[PDB]
Amino acid sequence: SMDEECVLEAENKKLVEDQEKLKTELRKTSDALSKAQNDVMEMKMQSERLSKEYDQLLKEHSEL
Amino acid sequence: SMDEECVLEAENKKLVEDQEKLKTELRKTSDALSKAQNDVMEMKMQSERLSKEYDQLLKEHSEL
């Protein structure tokens, strides 16, 4: 009936609105996860580089 | 019409099901982010600690 349809329509508008909010939130959370995963990666290869230069410093002083 | 009603109904079902997919997906991502944020703090304190003894090691050798 026309009334049932108008209820379904109203419900569908609300669900689409909620889906937009949910997608937005998923998108932010997901970006944040990505950035954090890069930061952990960038700090590791940074840290490795640093340790190599550390050991090298020790050597510069162990071999004169 | 009854055709329209049946389409709206099908769409309503799909939207409710997708809403659950999105909620779970969000909950998982949020948990993963939580873990990665902890790893960032871990990574940080390691890298900074390393960097500090490196700067100290450099300072000890520097005066001309």
Query: What 3-state class would DSSP assign to A62?
Result: coil
CATH of the domain at B9: 1.20.5.110
Note the helical H segments in B1-64: 2-61
Q: Quick check: B19 and A15 in contact, CB under 8 A? A: yes
The helix (H) or strand (E) run that includes residue A3 is helix A2-60
Query: In one letter, which amino acid is B32?
Result: A
What residues in B contact A12, CB-CB < 8 Å? 8, 11-12, 15
CB-CB under 8 Å, B15 with A12: yes
Residue of chain B with shortest Cα separation from A39: B40
Query: What 3-state class would DSSP assign to B11?
Result: helix
A28 token code pair: 């932010």
Nearest to B8 among A9, A16, A33 (CB): A9
Query: In one letter, which amino acid is A18?
Result: D
Domain hosting A23: range is 1-64
B43 token code pair: 């990574």
CB-CB under 8 Å, B54 with A50: yes
Q: According to the entry, how was the structure determined?
A: X-ray
Query: In one letter, which amino acid is A51?
Result: S
Select from A32, A34, A44, A29 the least CA-distant residue to B44. Answer: A44
Q: B41 Cβ partners below 8 Å, 6+ apart?
A: none
Count the domains in chain B: 1
**How many CA atoms lie less than 13 Å away from B37 in the CB half-sphere?**
11
CB-CB under 8 Å, B51 with A50: yes
